[PDB]
Amino acid sequence: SFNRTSFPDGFVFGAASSAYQFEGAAKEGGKGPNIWDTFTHEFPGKISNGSTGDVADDFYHRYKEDVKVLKFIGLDGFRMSISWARVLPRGKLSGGVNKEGIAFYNNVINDLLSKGIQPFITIFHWDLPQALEDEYGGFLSPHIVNDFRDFAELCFKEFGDRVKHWITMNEPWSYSYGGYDAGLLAPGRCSAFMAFCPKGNSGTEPYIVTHNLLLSHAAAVKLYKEKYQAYQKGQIGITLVTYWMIPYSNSKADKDAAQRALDFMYGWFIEPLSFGEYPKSMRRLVGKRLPRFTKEQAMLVKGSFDFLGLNYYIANYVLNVPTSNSVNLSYTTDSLSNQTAFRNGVAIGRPTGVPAFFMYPKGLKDLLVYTKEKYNDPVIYITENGMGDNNNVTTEEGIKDPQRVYFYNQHLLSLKNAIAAGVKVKGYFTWAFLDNFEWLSGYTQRFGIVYVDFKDGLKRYPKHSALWFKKFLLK
Numbered sequence: 001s002f003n004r005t006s007f008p009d010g011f012v013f014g015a016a017s018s019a020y021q022f023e024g025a026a027k028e029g030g031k032g033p034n035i036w037d038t039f040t041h042e043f044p045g046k047i048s049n050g051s052t053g054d055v056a057d058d059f060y061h062r063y064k065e066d067v068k069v070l071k072f073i074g075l076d077g078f079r080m081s082i083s084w085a086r087v088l089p090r091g092k093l094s095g096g097v098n099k100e101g102i103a104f105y106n107n108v109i110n111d112l113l114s115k116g117i118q119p120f121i122t123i124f125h126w127d128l129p130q131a132l133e134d135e136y137g138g139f140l141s142p143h144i145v146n147d148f149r150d151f152a153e154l155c156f157k158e159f160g161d162r163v164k165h166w167i168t169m170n171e172p173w174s175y176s177y178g179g180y181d182a183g184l185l186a187p188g189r190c191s192a193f194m195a196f197c198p199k200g201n202s203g204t205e206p207y208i209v210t211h212n213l214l215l216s217h218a219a220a221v222k223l224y225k226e227k228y229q230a231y232q233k234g235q236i237g238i239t240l241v242t243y244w245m246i247p248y249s250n251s252k253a254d255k256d257a258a259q260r261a262l263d264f265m266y267g268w269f270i271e272p273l274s275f276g277e278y279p280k281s282m283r284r285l286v287g288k289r290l291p292r293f294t295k296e297q298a299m300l301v302k303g304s305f306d307f308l309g310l311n312y313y314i315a316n317y318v319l320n321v322p323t324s325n326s327v328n329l330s331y332t333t334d335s336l337s338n339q340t341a342f343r344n345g346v347a348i349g350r351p352t353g354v355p356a357f358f359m360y361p362k363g364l365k366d367l368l369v370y371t372k373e374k375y376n377d378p379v380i381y382i383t384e385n386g387m388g389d390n391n392n393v394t395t396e397e398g399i400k401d402p403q404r405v406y407f408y409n410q411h412l413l414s415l416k417n418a419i420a421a422g423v424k425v426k427g428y429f430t431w432a433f434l435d436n437f438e439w440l441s442g443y444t445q446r447f448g449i450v451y452v453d454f455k456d457g458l459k460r461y462p463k464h465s466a467l468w469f470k471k472f473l474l475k
């Protein structure tokens with residue numbers, strides 16, 4: 001049977017989570033407010049069912065039992081994030097450290113390590129303290145960099161003796177696009193012509209924010225390398241998400257469109273991280289709306305990772321979009337490309353419970369080989385991979401998830417192929433550990449290998465996928 005022995009010795013298999021999506025205790029334990037507390041409460045129409053992460057999975061209180069479930073599955077690693085406003089309630093270091101917040105993360109880490117599970121810790125998973133958003137507009141401002149650095153340093157100082165894998169941030173594409181182009185994610189900003197957000201500019205702010213995300217990342221990495229890595233002996237990277245782009249047709253127009261789509265989503269980050277420069281297509285199409293790295297900034301950002309985390313979910317077909325005389329100016333329309341999961345009406349792969357998301361396991365290897373070939377064979381972790389069910393069956397039926405067993409079998413086979421093609425993948429994390437608060441989708445989508453019965457006291461039930469993973473892991 002297909003099992004972990006097919007993967008390199010010491011390969012890390014894990015499951016993933018994040019703080020706002022799992023913890024709850026949003027106003028407890030000394031925690032201060034973050035932009036997702038604010039967003040979910042002030043824009044309920046932007047979350048399915050007007051849900052919040054006020055309680056989520058209550059991982060804050062239930063972590064001891066959840067860590068037992070991780071051990072039961074037999075996982076090697078666990079991805080989790082630090083809630084910035086839980087440890088620094090006013091965002092700034094001078095605003096004071098919340099000892100009870102530090103204590104929570106220490107408790108989780110110590111329990112994880114006692115079970116032989118390596119913590120892979122994301123420093124920033126979108127839950128910016130409201131205090132920083134209010135003071136200077138969060139990642140719209142160059143001021144964010146040094147507050148981010150202090151936050152990262154707090155983490156290194158308090159946890160780095162035990163944590164040996166750091167991720168500066170998760171999916172800065174999602175933060176920038178979702179938060180500042182489409183206004184679908186906190187802090188919920190977009191152009192006035194969209195009649196969807198009170199403030200913003202979809203044609204400028206995504207580029208401003210991405211620049212500052214990259215600079216904040218780079219500052220944290222520099223600090224880790226110079227002050228902590230030699231003694232703590234850990235590794236630091238960053239997690240990027242991209243869809244794999246397939247040309248809608250064999251035309252040059254569609255081939256080019258597919259690459260532009262990949263440039264704007266993926267290259268936007270990985271080309272600065274690899275080359276110290278933005279993609280040529282973005283320089284060309286976005287022009288002076290796209291910030292330039294100074295010589296010093298380029299040197300700081302280029303090479304600023306020990307490993308690359310990749311989140312992979314889907315592939316899309318891409319169509320060329322001709323220029324117009326009608327300027328709905330936005331990051332989204334800048335790429336002159338249109339993504340669709342359908343060619344001639346037929347989906348790109350097996351359906352899932354999520355309408356836009358189809359199964360395309362080939363695209364994981366395709367992405368990995370592309371990354372190897374373009375960005376100098378980096379060390380890679382698959383930091384997220386998974387699928388969602390719709391939340392409208394019973395607990396007993398929700399636990400039976402052969403479609404997710406299928407999903408993981410196919411993607412791990414594809415991952416095995418990528419490794420055999422020479423891609424330096426060192427680990428793999430399922431999104432998600434638990435069914436959780438899936439941002440704008442609230443609790444309508446279930447990505448977990450463990451079922452959470454939100455209607456019955458948040459009870460945990462391992463799904464068939466979790467039991468399959470347990471068998472796969474020889475545990």
Ligand SMILES: *[C@@H]1O[C@H](CO)[C@@H](O)[C@H](O)[C@H]1NC(C)=O
Pocket residue numbers: 001002003004005006
């Ligand atoms: C796991 O896979 C290997 C192939 O690499 C096989 O030799 C071994 O018997 C398998 N173990 C199981 C299925 O328990």
